[PDB]
Design an enzyme around this catalytic site. Structure first.
Site, PDB file in Angstrom:
ATOM      1  N   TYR A   1      84.829  54.776  53.481  1.00 56.89           N
ATOM      2  CA  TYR A   1      83.737  53.884  53.877  1.00 56.89           C
ATOM      3  C   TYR A   1      83.640  53.788  55.393  1.00 56.89           C
ATOM      4  O   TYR A   1      82.560  53.957  55.977  1.00 56.89           O
ATOM      5  CB  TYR A   1      83.935  52.486  53.283  1.00 56.89           C
ATOM      6  CG  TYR A   1      83.740  52.353  51.786  1.00 56.89           C
ATOM      7  CD1 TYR A   1      83.543  53.464  50.976  1.00 56.89           C
ATOM      8  CD2 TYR A   1      83.727  51.098  51.191  1.00 56.89           C
ATOM      9  CE1 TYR A   1      83.361  53.325  49.614  1.00 56.89           C
ATOM     10  CE2 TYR A   1      83.542  50.950  49.838  1.00 56.89           C
ATOM     11  CZ  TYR A   1      83.361  52.066  49.053  1.00 56.89           C
ATOM     12  OH  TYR A   1      83.179  51.914  47.702  1.00 56.89           O
TER      13      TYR A   1
ATOM     14  N   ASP B   1      91.159  63.997  49.232  1.00 54.42           N
ATOM     15  CA  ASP B   1      91.068  62.555  49.441  1.00 54.42           C
ATOM     16  C   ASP B   1      90.544  62.328  50.851  1.00 54.42           C
ATOM     17  O   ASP B   1      91.187  62.737  51.819  1.00 54.42           O
ATOM     18  CB  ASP B   1      92.440  61.889  49.257  1.00 54.42           C
ATOM     19  CG  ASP B   1      92.395  60.374  49.401  1.00 54.42           C
ATOM     20  OD1 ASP B   1      93.299  59.711  48.855  1.00 54.42           O
ATOM     21  OD2 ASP B   1      91.479  59.832  50.050  1.00 54.42           O
ATOM     22  N   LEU B   2      89.406  61.654  50.970  1.00 57.37           N
ATOM     23  CA  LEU B   2      88.760  61.476  52.264  1.00 57.37           C
ATOM     24  C   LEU B   2      89.501  60.461  53.130  1.00 57.37           C
ATOM     25  O   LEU B   2      90.064  59.482  52.633  1.00 57.37           O
ATOM     26  CB  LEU B   2      87.309  61.040  52.064  1.00 57.37           C
ATOM     27  CG  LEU B   2      86.548  62.090  51.253  1.00 57.37           C
ATOM     28  CD1 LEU B   2      85.092  61.736  51.010  1.00 57.37           C
ATOM     29  CD2 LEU B   2      86.653  63.402  51.973  1.00 57.37           C
TER      30      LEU B   2
ATOM     31  N   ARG C   1      94.285  50.692  61.980  1.00 54.01           N
ATOM     32  CA  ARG C   1      95.599  50.771  61.356  1.00 54.01           C
ATOM     33  C   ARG C   1      96.707  50.759  62.398  1.00 54.01           C
ATOM     34  O   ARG C   1      97.790  50.223  62.138  1.00 54.01           O
ATOM     35  CB  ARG C   1      95.691  52.016  60.470  1.00 54.01           C
ATOM     36  CG  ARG C   1      94.876  51.868  59.197  1.00 54.01           C
ATOM     37  CD  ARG C   1      94.870  53.093  58.298  1.00 54.01           C
ATOM     38  NE  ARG C   1      93.603  53.160  57.572  1.00 54.01           N
ATOM     39  CZ  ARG C   1      93.415  53.799  56.421  1.00 54.01           C
ATOM     40  NH1 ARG C   1      94.420  54.426  55.828  1.00 54.01           N
ATOM     41  NH2 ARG C   1      92.217  53.794  55.856  1.00 54.01           N
TER      42      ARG C   1
ATOM     43  N   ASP D   1      86.021  58.917  46.405  1.00 51.86           N
ATOM     44  CA  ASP D   1      86.473  59.787  47.483  1.00 51.86           C
ATOM     45  C   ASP D   1      87.581  60.761  47.102  1.00 51.86           C
ATOM     46  O   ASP D   1      88.162  61.382  48.001  1.00 51.86           O
ATOM     47  CB  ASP D   1      86.908  58.954  48.700  1.00 51.86           C
ATOM     48  CG  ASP D   1      88.389  58.574  48.686  1.00 51.86           C
ATOM     49  OD1 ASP D   1      88.936  58.230  47.617  1.00 51.86           O
ATOM     50  OD2 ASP D   1      88.998  58.603  49.779  1.00 51.86           O
ATOM     51  N   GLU D   2      87.879  60.952  45.819  1.00 56.16           N
ATOM     52  CA  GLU D   2      88.868  61.954  45.447  1.00 56.16           C
ATOM     53  C   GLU D   2      88.259  62.968  44.490  1.00 56.16           C
ATOM     54  O   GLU D   2      87.429  62.620  43.645  1.00 56.16           O
ATOM     55  CB  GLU D   2      90.112  61.298  44.843  1.00 56.16           C
ATOM     56  CG  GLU D   2      90.884  60.492  45.875  1.00 56.16           C
ATOM     57  CD  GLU D   2      92.083  59.781  45.291  1.00 56.16           C
ATOM     58  OE1 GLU D   2      92.637  60.263  44.277  1.00 56.16           O
ATOM     59  OE2 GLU D   2      92.479  58.742  45.855  1.00 56.16           O
TER      60      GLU D   2
HETATM   61  N1  0KX Z   1      90.508  48.936  45.769  1.00 57.48           N
HETATM   62  C1  0KX Z   1      89.634  49.705  46.465  1.00 57.48           C
HETATM   63  C2  0KX Z   1      90.006  50.979  46.886  1.00 57.48           C
HETATM   64  C3  0KX Z   1      89.102  51.759  47.597  1.00 57.48           C
HETATM   65  N2  0KX Z   1      87.881  51.279  47.872  1.00 57.48           N
HETATM   66  C4  0KX Z   1      86.939  52.104  48.622  1.00 57.48           C
HETATM   67  C5  0KX Z   1      87.145  51.890  50.118  1.00 57.48           C
HETATM   68  C6  0KX Z   1      87.802  53.169  50.608  1.00 57.48           C
HETATM   69  O1  0KX Z   1      87.299  53.541  51.895  1.00 57.48           O
HETATM   70  C7  0KX Z   1      87.435  54.209  49.557  1.00 57.48           C
HETATM   71  C8  0KX Z   1      88.490  55.307  49.376  1.00 57.48           C
HETATM   72  O2  0KX Z   1      89.689  54.805  48.783  1.00 57.48           O
HETATM   73  P1  0KX Z   1      91.117  55.089  49.477  1.00 57.48           P
HETATM   74  O3  0KX Z   1      91.220  56.575  49.702  1.00 57.48           O
HETATM   75  O4  0KX Z   1      92.184  54.429  48.637  1.00 57.48           O
HETATM   76  N3  0KX Z   1      91.119  54.223  51.004  1.00 57.48           N
HETATM   77  P2  0KX Z   1      90.593  55.139  52.411  1.00 57.48           P
HETATM   78  O5  0KX Z   1      89.992  56.467  52.023  1.00 57.48           O
HETATM   79  O6  0KX Z   1      89.702  54.195  53.187  1.00 57.48           O
HETATM   80  O7  0KX Z   1      91.908  55.388  53.317  1.00 57.48           O
HETATM   81  P3  0KX Z   1      92.838  56.706  53.290  1.00 57.48           P
HETATM   82  O8  0KX Z   1      92.521  57.460  52.019  1.00 57.48           O
HETATM   83  O9  0KX Z   1      92.433  57.425  54.557  1.00 57.48           O
HETATM   84  O10 0KX Z   1      94.241  56.143  53.326  1.00 57.48           O
HETATM   85  O11 0KX Z   1      87.231  53.479  48.343  1.00 57.48           O
HETATM   86  C9  0KX Z   1      87.519  49.986  47.444  1.00 57.48           C
HETATM   87  O12 0KX Z   1      86.381  49.542  47.703  1.00 57.48           O
HETATM   88  N4  0KX Z   1      88.402  49.234  46.751  1.00 57.48           N
HETATM   89 MG    MG Z   2      91.442  57.796  47.882  1.00 55.08          MG
HETATM   90 MG    MG Z   3      90.846  58.215  51.026  1.00 52.73          MG
END
Ligand code: 0KX
Ligand code: MG
Ligand code: MG
Ligand code: MG
EC number: 2.7.7.7
Length: 381
Positions: free
Chosen positions: A14, A9-10, A46, A101-102
């Site tokens: 974005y 999981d990144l 954050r 991202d997973e």
């Molecule tokens: N409901 C959502 C969930 C995620 N996304 C996009 C934005 C996120 O950067 C990306 C990855 O999802 P995410 O892992 O849940 N959030 P993000 O990676 O930014 O934070 P962490 O994983 O570091 O907590 O998908 C979106 O556009 N709408």
């Molecule tokens: Mg994710």
């Molecule tokens: Mg992520």
DNA sequence: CTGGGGTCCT
DNA sequence: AGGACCC
């Protein structure tokens, strides 16, 4: 029978891409915006109280110095996503994507081949990479511990390759099934990894504070279970199978109860190329057929580019709308001649098709408005 | 002030 | 065609 699975999981995906594009935002608190939604923010933001999926009014009120970048165009995020998936596919060919991202990877075969190369004097030297969930003691004589530790090493190599080759950081979780890997990957964030030994499964599962935190239990199922007096993981574990089947159907019931025990037999499936290509555009108001038609032309141009780059052709098109208070859609097959001529003026025929589909849903003679117009190309071959 | 994508099942 | 789920 026992698998070794990794979940990747990144970190703030974005936002991480935006920070790689323009390093001026590396140390500024950064949120990525889509209309009035801050879909994500980097970790600096954050710390100042910005959370994922805040609206921008709350985001700037909790953090008025938040730098915001528009992320309504997913192109760069999409490219990066598939670069990550392909890199992981180099390790083991069967990689399952979840969102952009997973990724799940089944490391069982890899772990086995690594252990078969090791000789018995160094089965004692096997070491974990990263965190062990809940500080559980490793038993080197436990074969499952040994193979989960090897899995942690492969996970570390994966994250290092992601960083050195693509400049991306993320978290990994190693466990014995997809559910446990995904639940344990987020225990230490950001840019860290955790391994779950079996003795701690229950601990992990009972660390959750509501059932909706279980992947597979969504908004509707959660609300139903709450209506049934089920709020904890143990509530769902101990609830009557019969009644649960009665209100959720057999499938949902059996699956989510097994999940509440931390059981998940589902295999890691090869995602491969996407099953669909869609673009959306939401707005406050669209009431002109000429306006909607322009929107649809615009979505369609980008979609044509993307499908042409893929090198396979779609055999179905769909149009989706939302009326101002759910969503509604109409699809149809793409004619054979237009299909043969993809990547010639494909635009005008596709426009006529999509507009007829449009008028099937919305009566132009009456007045209307619309809040969402979307085009999907699916049924690729 | 609730985006912009995806998957599979019914 | 819609619905549930995922990010
Ligand atoms: N409901 C959502 C969930 C995620 N996304 C996009 C934005 C996120 O950067 C990306 C990855 O999802 P995410 O892992 O849940 N959030 P993000 O990676 O930014 O934070 P962490 O994983 O570091 O907590 O998908 C979106 O556009 N709408
Ligand atoms: Mg994710
Ligand atoms: Mg992520
Ligand atoms: Mg859930």
């Amino acid at each position: 029978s026992s698998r070794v699975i990794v979940h990747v999981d990144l970190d703030c995906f974005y936002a991480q891409v935006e920070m790689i594009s323009n390093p001026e935002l590396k140390d500024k608190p950064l949120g990525v915006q889509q209309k009035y939604l801050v879909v994500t923010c980097n970790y600096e933001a954050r710390k100042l109280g910005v959370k994922k999926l805040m609206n921008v009014r709350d985001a700037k009120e909790k953090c008025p110095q938040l730098v915001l970048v528009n992320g309504e165009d997913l192109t760069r995020y999409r490219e990066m996503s598939y670069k990550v998936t392909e890199l992981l596919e180099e390790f083991s060919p069967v990689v399952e994507r979840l969102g952009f991202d997973e990724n799940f990877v089944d490391l069982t075969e890899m772990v086995e081949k690594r252990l078969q190369q090791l000789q018995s004097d160094e089965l004692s030297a096997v070491t974990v990479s990263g965190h062990v969930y809940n500080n559980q003691s490793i038993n080197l004589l436990d074969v499952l511990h040994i193979r989960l530790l090897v899995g942690s090493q492969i996970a570390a190599e994966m994250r290092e390759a992601m960083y050195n080759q693509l400049g991306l950081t993320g978290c990994a979780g190693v466990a014995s099934n997809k559910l446990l890997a995904k639940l344990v990957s987020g225990v230490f964030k950001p840019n860290q990894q955790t391994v779950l030994l079996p003795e701690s499964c229950q601990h992990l599962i009972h660390s959750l504070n509501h059932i909706k935190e279980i992947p597979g239990i969504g908004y509707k199922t959660a609300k139903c279970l709450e209506a049934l007096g089920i709020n904890s993981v143990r509530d769902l574990q101990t609830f009557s199978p019969k009644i649960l089947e009665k209100e959720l159907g057999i499938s949902v019931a059996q699956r989510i109860q097994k999940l509440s025990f931390g059981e998940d037999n589902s295999p890691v499936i090869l995602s491969g190329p996407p099953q669909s290509f869609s673009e959306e555009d939401s707005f406050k108001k669209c009431s002109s057929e000429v306006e909607a038609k322009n929107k649809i032309e615009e979505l369609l141009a980008s979609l044509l580019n993307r499908v042409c780059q893929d090198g396979r052709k779609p055999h179905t098109v769909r149009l989706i709308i939302r009326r101002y208070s759910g969503r509604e859609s109409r699809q149809c097959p793409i004619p054979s001649h237009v299909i043969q001529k993809l990547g010639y003026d494909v635009m005008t025929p596709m426009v006529d098709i999509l507009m007829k589909l449009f008028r099937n849903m919305v009566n132009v003679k009456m007045p209307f408005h619309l809040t969402l117009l979307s085009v999907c190309f699916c049924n690729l071959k």
